[PDB]
């Protein structure tokens, strides 16, 4: 599964990190999960906000202030 | 990279659904991201809860609310 891909993509970043220290990766790993997911439930439900929404399980408000903070729509 | 694989997971999730509705699949992709950048922090950081909210650039009460959610801990 998609779980083992993050786990790797992790071991690989971690893997070259050295003295640089990391503060933010969790909303660095969100942003590339985000992203696609935002942009593949818009693709199917082809830019229906308020279907992608729901199949999200996710208030139409914040698809729309998801899409924002990304610059998709 | 990584959100080629959440492109990939994500036209294999829709394939299989043969016109069901979903409504969840926020939950459903963060889970699966969510524990293991949890468990591959927590090993990095040794098991030290406070170097792994700062490396994650959250605070300590939200990494114990996560780390409850998959019983991480």
Same mark, same amino acid.
């Given at each position: !599964? %998609?779980? =083992?891909? $993050?786990? #790797?993509?992790?071991?690989?970043?971690?893997?070259?990190?050295?003295?640089?220290?990391?503060?933010?990766?969790?909303?660095?790993?969100?942003?590339?999960?985000?992203? !696609? %997911?935002? =942009?593949? $439930?818009? #693709?199917?439900?082809?830019?229906?906000?308020?279907?992608?929404?729901?199949?999200?399980?996710?208030?139409?408000?914040?698809?729309?202030?998801?899409?924002?903070?990304?610059?998709?729509?």
């Amino acid at each position: !599964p %998609l779980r =083992d891909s $993050v786990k #790797q993509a992790l071991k690989n970043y971690f893997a070259q990190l050295n003295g640089q220290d990391v503060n933010d990766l969790y909303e660095l790993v969100l942003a590339e999960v985000e992203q !696609p %997911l935002l =942009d593949m $439930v818009m #693709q199917y439900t082809r830019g229906n906000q308020t279907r992608a929404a729901l199949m999200m399980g996710i208030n139409r408000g914040t698809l729309c202030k998801k899409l924002k903070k990304y610059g998709m729509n």
